[PDB]
Every structure is written in C-alpha cells, then in structure tokens.
Amino acid sequence: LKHFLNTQDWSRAELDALLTQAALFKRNKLGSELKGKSIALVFFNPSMRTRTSFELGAFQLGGHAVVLQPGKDAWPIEFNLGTVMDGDTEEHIAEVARVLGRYVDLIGVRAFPKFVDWSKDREDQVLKSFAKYSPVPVINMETITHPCQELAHALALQEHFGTPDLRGKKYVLTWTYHPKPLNTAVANSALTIATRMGMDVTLLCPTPDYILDERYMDWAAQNVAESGGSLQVSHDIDSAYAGADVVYAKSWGALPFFGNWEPEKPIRDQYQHFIVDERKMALTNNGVFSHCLPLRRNVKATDAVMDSPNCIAIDEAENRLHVQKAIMAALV
Amino acid sequence: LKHFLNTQDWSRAELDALLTQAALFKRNKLGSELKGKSIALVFFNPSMRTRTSFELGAFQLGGHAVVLQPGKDAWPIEFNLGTVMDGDTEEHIAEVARVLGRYVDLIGVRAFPKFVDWSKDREDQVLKSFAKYSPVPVINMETITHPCQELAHALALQEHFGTPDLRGKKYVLTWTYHPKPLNTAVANSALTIATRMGMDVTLLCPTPDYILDERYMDWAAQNVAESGGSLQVSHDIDSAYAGADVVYAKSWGALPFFGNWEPEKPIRDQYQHFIVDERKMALTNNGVFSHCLPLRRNVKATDAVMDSPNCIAIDEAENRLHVQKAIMAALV
Amino acid sequence: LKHFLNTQDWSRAELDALLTQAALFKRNKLGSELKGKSIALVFFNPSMRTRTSFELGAFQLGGHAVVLQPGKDAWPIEFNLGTVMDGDTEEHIAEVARVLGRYVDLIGVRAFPKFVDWSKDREDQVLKSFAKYSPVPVINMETITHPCQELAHALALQEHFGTPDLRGKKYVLTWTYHPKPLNTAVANSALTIATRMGMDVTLLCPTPDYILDERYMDWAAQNVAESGGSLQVSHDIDSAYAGADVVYAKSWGALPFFGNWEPEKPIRDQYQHFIVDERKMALTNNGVFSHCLPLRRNVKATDAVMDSPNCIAIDEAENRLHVQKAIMAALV
C-alpha cells in the first residue's frame, strides 16, 4: 500500500508527476477524482490552512472530508503496544485505524511532537501507527516532517522562477525568533525538498545547538549527491543571505533542549535579530521570501518584508490546496 | 468589492431585491447559485442557528461551508497594525484574510465585542479588518450589528402582515432582563431595520443609560426622515406597548458601564419586570412578538407569550436560512 | 410521526426491513435517498464512530449532516419545563427542536446520563424532549439505550452465522472491568436486541448490584416470551461462557451506586478478572466476540482476544454506517 508520509519515500518521477498534477488542478479546480469518496482528517493539534485546504479539496473533487479531533470530539487514542490501557486513553490505534478504514478511503493525520523527549518524538509513532494499521492510504498532515508543505513550497518556487528546474539556485533556510520553542517539522521538510530539488542550500541558524536532527541532515546530503546541489551549515547571517535566490524562514527549539526548555529560553531571546527584515533581504539576489504560516509579524519577519512583492507566502499557502488534491488523487 | 456588513450600507432597492430573492429561495430551496463555490464561516463566538443555517444554505445551493473557530481549531488571530506579535496571537488578519481569499469565494465572520471597552468594541475592528484585507466578499454573521437578523426579521414581518409595506405599523423594540450584560448588536440592528422600513419606532428601555450608541440612534433618525416613519425613546412600559403592531425584545448591557459591570448588575436586577408577559402583550393591537434567540424562558419572555400564536420567533429563525442564501447569491 | 428511539418501539417486521435495507446499502453504498436533505447531529458527549458514520452516510445518500455540540459550539440547552432560566442554560429545547425542525429533515441526538441520579437519568429526558417538540423524525445516537448499535451488532451476527435466524444461539452479555463507572446504554441495548432475536441470553455480571434496570430486564422477558429464546442472570464466569456462540462485553457502573461512586470503586477493582481473555473464550463453542468500542486493550479484553479471527468488533463498527443509512432512509 502506498502512503504519503514523506517525499523522501517517493521517487523524483513520482514527485514531479505530483507537482504537475497539482499545477493542472490549479487550472481546473473542479473534478471527479474523489467522487463518492471520503477522507478522515485527524487533527491532534490546531490548524487553519490544512483543515480548510483538505476539506475544500475533497469537496472540489466530488468527495467529503470528515474532520476529527481526538480528545476534543473523538475519543483519545493510545499508541503503545501491549500496555494496560487504564490511563487517559480510551481506545487503541489498532482499532481506530481499522474502523476508519471501513468508513473512509483516505486518512490524513496531524500530530506534533509532545516536546518532552525528542528521542520519542523523532520516532513519528502516531503517523507510523496509522500507516501500519490502516487498510487505506495515509497522508502526513504534519508530524515531524511536513511533506504537503514541501510540495506547496516547491510548486510556488517553480512558478516564481517560471521553470520546474531549480538547480543552481541559492536557497537559504533560516531560523527566526519566536517566544516559544517550536516543531522542527517545516525546517526538516524544507531542507529535504530544497536539496531534493538540487539547490545550493544553506542552513542558517544561531549556534550548532540549532542544527537539525541528523536524520534530515543525512537525507539532505544523500539528496545533494543525487541532485547535484549542495548543503552547508552557517551561523553568519550576512554571508548566508548574500546572493540568495530564496529565503525560507522558520523558528524551532534546539533539539538538545527537548524536555528542558527553561535554559534555552534565554538563549533564543538573544537572537531575535535573526528576524528577516529589509536589510537582510537586501543582501539577496532579488530573492524571494516565504514562510509556512502562521507567522507573527515583527517577530519572525517585519511588516515591510511580508508586504514586499518578493514575499510568496500567500501563493505557497494557496498551493497547499492544489498539491494536496494531487496527493489524494494519486493515492485513491 | 461589495460586502454585506450592514444593511445601512445598502440601498433600499438592493435590500428589497434581497428580501424578494429570499422569499423566492423559500419556495425553491435547492439551486445552483453556489455550485462548486465555498464559504468560510469564521466564528469567534458560539452559534447554533447561524452556523447551521449558513452551512445548510451553502449545501442547498451546491456549495460548501468550512466552519472555523480561531483559538479552538484554527490559530488565534491578531488585528492591530504594526504591533510586535509576541502575545497570544500567532498570525495577523492581513495573512488570514489573504490566504482564505485564495481558498473560498466568501467569508462570513462572527465576533462579539470583548465587553471591556465600548470605545474599542464599537470600532468593529474584526469585521472591518476582514473586509479590508479579503479579496472576496465579507458577510457579517454578527459583530456589533446583525444585518442577517434584520432581514430575517423584516421578511418575517412582511409575511405576517401579508405585504412588503410595513409603513405606519407601530414597532416596539424593548429591552428585557438577563442575569448578565449582553451585546447590543441585535438591538442596534432592529432599530436600524425597523426605521429603514419606515415604521413608527419606540425604543423602550429602563433608563437613559440603556439608550443605544449614538451611531445607531443617528442611523435611525436619518432612516425615519427618508422613509416617513418615526423614532422615539421611552421608559414607560404601558404607554409603549399601547397599540403596538410589533414587539421585539432584546436584552443588553448599558453602554456607559462597559468594562465596569459590577455596579450595573444591581441596576438591571431591579427591572426584570420588563419581561414580555401576557399583560404587556395584551395592551398591543393584536401585535406580533419576536426575539432573535437564544431566549431564556420566564426571564426574557414568559412561557405563555412564547407559545402564543402571535410569537413569530420560529418563523424569523427559519428565515435566517433564506435571507442568507439571498445574500451569498448576491455577493457571489 | 415515526422516530427511531428504541428498537423495542418497532415491530419485528419493521426491524427486519431495516436490517435488510442495511445489507442492501452495504452492497450499493451510493444512493439518492437523502438527496438535498439534511440531518442535525446533536452531540452532548464525545464520539468518533457515530459522528463519522452518520456524516458519511448522509453524504453517500446525497444529503448533508450538520454536527452540533451544545456548550461547545452551539448554545447550552435547557430541558425542564416552567423553570426560570437564570442558570447556565441559554435557551429551551422547545425552541431548539422547533428551529432545527425548520432547517433539517432529521435530528440525531447523543446525550449520556449525568451519573448523579439514575432516577433522573433513566427518564431519558433529552431524547424524549427532542422527540416531543421536533416536527421531524428523531434518531437516538445513544442516551440510555443505543438502538443504532443493536442493529449494527445484530447485522454483524447474522452475517457471521450466514443467516437472519439467530434463534437457539447461546448469547453471553458480560460485564467487564474499567477504571471508571460507565453508561449501561449498550448493555441495555444488547439485552434488548439479543432477546428480540430470540437467543438464549445470559447476563453475566459480578454481583446482583450490577444487574440492569428493571425496565430492560422486563423488555427482555417480554421479548423472550415472544421470540422463543431465554433470559438468565449469572455471576459464575465459567458456566456462563460454556458453549456460548456469542460473547458481547461491556462495562458499566452499578445502578444502585449512582451519584455515590466512591464506594463502588473498590468493588469493581476486585473484579477486573472479568476481562475477556483466551481462557474464557476457550470455553465457548468457537464463539464470536465483540464490543461496541471504544475498548481499552488489556483491561476489557486482552490483545490476543481482540486480534483473534473470532473478534467481529470491526465488522460491527463498520455496520453502524449501513444500518444508520437504513434508518435515515426509512424515517425520511
């Protein structure tokens, strides 16, 4: 059974076919690819774009999305095997995925890490469990990676440069400030897709403590080798932005401080100057800027940057709708 | 771009066309005016009728409504300009409205005042922000006015009297008791639509402290002058109800006590006799009674009044569905 | 007006027609029985299967379900008559049911007992109120009985034995452990449907304190007399399971301890050995096992039992979709 858990699992030809189908759906939004079909959107965390885009996408293709929120409207789910369920969990994922599999044709899942132990969060237990027990295709709506965002981001870049080939472009994935420590998912996905696209990638962050999990650094290295791009970690803002064609900002908490955020709070607080402003964007090569949203203005990016004609964040957000429809159509 | 923020913004011919389209939809509920289209219903406060009527209306016209609840399922939104977003707000309305504008064809918004500072609440910031940044038509699902309710109310009155012309009718908008201070929205809208319809309007309330914001008193005066009706503020129950053709009850907190409700609590508590009972309705001219709902029985109106054949509250509530479909069809 | 509040209210011929229509819908899932129609699913308690199955069922039949959650998204409702609504309740069921009746064609309701006074919970006030004031058919989505579950359960049994006639089969409805006291609804429904099907039923529970309310014991006795089966209460595990063809587990709090759960906590804690494991299932006559879900593994049933080919819980859960579509089609 084929799922969409990570782009890294898909071949380039498959990914390209997805992006092309996405571009096609953007031209002809109404279709019958999901006529009489349905998808269960299981959210363990908040969402505005994801929930809206998937719901509308199912509708535009003649299908129906059922939005569920365990612990809110649906019952809380257990994921550990062989444990004695006497805690807050009412039922086990083995039952949930099998039942849903009798109702819907597709299952989307969103589950952020708990932020207490990266060792456990990095295992992607929720997503894997759904993929393991579900008799129907599973779609990652963001767990520790965000493959749907990668494709929306990629398509938006191809549309901006007027070509499917982004090789050679200088891509800067930069960390930015935020009062609280966030999921690395989007950062991990950006690194993954930018290198898979064969761009010259620079991971710009404050200190080595903010470097992404080895898993994704390794995925990127393997991708660079296969696509002809390049990977590089930098802590110097000015040299990073220099001549950049793309600047993708995202904030995340240092992995080494998982479950121990108190001491890392004073650490990030002294780097809020990583905020993407006009000055830093001025060093780029008339580069485009984007963020996955939700973004806090004057914290992650200044108002000027967000309103500049070079910010393609809205286009990228719109593309979430088109690429997800391509993914559902492919899996169905 | 044309929005439906307040009936006061629309011409009489436009309003009449809306009410007639509403009456038409009531006869033929299924249509294709919204085929393949969608509306984002953004609720910042609870709702039963509004959410249900809009959702079904979109469905009956071949479209789809996506229900969102910032702070609940969607991310909390910021509205102030140029501020440093380091508080509870994750993203700015500028982004939210622009993103939604890439997904849906219409945006409905419901946001009650915060009840801390009327000076700020009366600015209708949420609604205006959506209308400002949204590339698609915005619909007021109740903020400080409730235009959708005005039309449902108006249509129900025209159907009751068997005519579109309500000029000459004596209309009594009366305050009623409630343990807590409420939004003036419905009261403001009633005053607005009743005068726009050219009726002889009497705003019956306990003391001058309960008179509506000048903005709406002025809208009503201008409406009276243009339609040939009349406006009047009264604090005497018996003289108000006398010979009335319509009695519309609603409770609201005194504007002068915004952000300082403690001292106004003992003030309303001594006027719970404003409750619409058989006695007061007996003074009317076989007048009809209505309320926007949700209504607390034996507090705002007695059981007898609510069950009398003269209560048209259910009909008015049903009409929310029909007029809103007319509004969406017109804006699309 | 015909509602679906309990199977006990329906004749055998009607019930059989429902199960047959259900089997038919399972073969041809898409239809037009609810084209342009809608159902309001009012949930006062959590749900995953019920909400999903009804929502999809409405969609597959060309209709639309509107999901509501009083106190969450919709306004809190009052049910007592003639009371002064100055509490947490904003509106009365008389208004709610009448309004909904102007919007939707069907009303589903889910409302578990409050667990403070069985004398009040057993009156089924919410369900009855909706059925009383609603101008359109009402469907029990589980209150103190769960008729939709009975039919899903019944159909699954008929499919398992390859016949509509389950007379003669030995049916064991057994109590099982759970850290907290639960609703007896499913247990009451199982007893009701198993006897209505004319099986030899044994209610296996720890002590006489766990025997179901007389109402359902009496329904079962009347059913046994009419169908030719048999009813029996047992407290001995081994003799109960012996030669059983069906084993339906469910946990519930002792009725005599309603509103006084502290002393019954230590009572159930000494019977967690009622958990359906391989040993007990080994005594059966190659009997099938099922549970309504959500089920806690290793608490209500061991992992081995849940994964055995004799567990038909997933099939039964799937059938919720098919029988509910038959019910809606019949009531519409």
Ligand SMILES: CC(=O)N[C@@H](CCCNC(=O)CP(=O)(O)O)C(=O)O
């Ligand atoms: C700060 C926070 O917790 N945010 C998420 C945003 C994920 C990307 N954003 C989306 O997928 C858009 P939506 O569907 O509206 O959430 C994160 O940092 O991982």
Ligand SMILES: CC(=O)N[C@@H](CCCNC(=O)CP(=O)(O)O)C(=O)O
């Ligand atoms: C007491 C309270 O906060 N209520 C609101 C009711 C608004 C009119 N009522 C509606 O639009 C009906 P629904 O969509 O179900 O809320 C108010 O007083 O402004």
Ligand SMILES: CC(=O)N[C@@H](CCCNC(=O)CP(=O)(O)O)C(=O)O
């Ligand atoms: C422990 C608990 O409170 N549970 C309920 C389950 C009812 C049957 N189960 C269902 O109808 C499935 P769903 O629609 O997902 O709830 C009870 O014991 O009465």
